[PDB]
Amino acid sequence: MQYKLILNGKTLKGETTTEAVDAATAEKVFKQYANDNGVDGEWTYDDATKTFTVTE
């Protein structure tokens, strides 16, 4: 399955998706990716909607 991370930061907004087998392994990219793009906020995740979101 695929997970989609929505970028809701101060000035940085967009979309990010990845193809992973596990949900937690996918967060590794999204969580670490946040430092790479410059968005660090409160994370969340619903496996029933395959969607992550970081709000700062």
GROMACS .gro file of C-alpha atoms in nm, residues 2-54:
model
   53
    2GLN     CA    1   0.105   0.368  -0.017
    3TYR     CA    2   0.107   0.648   0.240
    4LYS     CA    3   0.060   1.018   0.169
    5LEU     CA    4   0.209   1.293   0.387
    6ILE     CA    5   0.059   1.644   0.364
    7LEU     CA    6   0.283   1.942   0.419
    8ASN     CA    7   0.119   2.197   0.645
    9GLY     CA    8   0.400   2.418   0.776
   10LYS     CA    9   0.466   2.786   0.824
   11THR     CA   10   0.542   2.865   0.455
   12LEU     CA   11   0.623   2.518   0.316
   13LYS     CA   12   0.321   2.337   0.163
   14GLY     CA   13   0.291   2.043  -0.077
   15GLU     CA   14   0.239   1.664  -0.097
   16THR     CA   15   0.463   1.362  -0.038
   17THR     CA   16   0.400   0.989  -0.094
   18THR     CA   17   0.604   0.670  -0.060
   19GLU     CA   18   0.564   0.298  -0.135
   20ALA     CA   19   0.624   0.090   0.180
   21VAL     CA   20   0.517  -0.245   0.323
   22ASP     CA   21   0.481  -0.119   0.680
   23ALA     CA   22   0.328   0.201   0.816
   24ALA     CA   23   0.602   0.272   1.071
   25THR     CA   24   0.882   0.223   0.812
   26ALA     CA   25   0.713   0.482   0.590
   27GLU     CA   26   0.720   0.738   0.871
   28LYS     CA   27   1.099   0.710   0.871
   29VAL     CA   28   1.111   0.887   0.536
   30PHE     CA   29   0.838   1.140   0.618
   31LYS     CA   30   0.975   1.210   0.967
   32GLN     CA   31   1.335   1.243   0.847
   33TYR     CA   32   1.222   1.417   0.528
   34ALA     CA   33   1.078   1.693   0.744
   35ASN     CA   34   1.428   1.797   0.851
   36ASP     CA   35   1.540   1.788   0.488
   37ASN     CA   36   1.262   2.026   0.375
   38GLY     CA   37   1.243   2.232   0.699
   39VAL     CA   38   0.901   2.138   0.848
   40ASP     CA   39   0.885   2.012   1.209
   41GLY     CA   40   0.542   1.990   1.377
   42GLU     CA   41   0.296   1.754   1.546
   43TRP     CA   42   0.260   1.428   1.352
   44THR     CA   43  -0.044   1.206   1.316
   45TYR     CA   44  -0.150   0.899   1.117
   46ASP     CA   45  -0.457   0.694   1.034
   47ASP     CA   46  -0.395   0.351   0.876
   48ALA     CA   47  -0.760   0.352   0.772
   49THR     CA   48  -0.692   0.647   0.536
   50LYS     CA   49  -0.322   0.590   0.461
   51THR     CA   50  -0.245   0.959   0.527
   52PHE     CA   51   0.015   1.140   0.744
   53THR     CA   52   0.015   1.511   0.835
   54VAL     CA   53   0.269   1.737   1.013
   0.00000   0.00000   0.00000
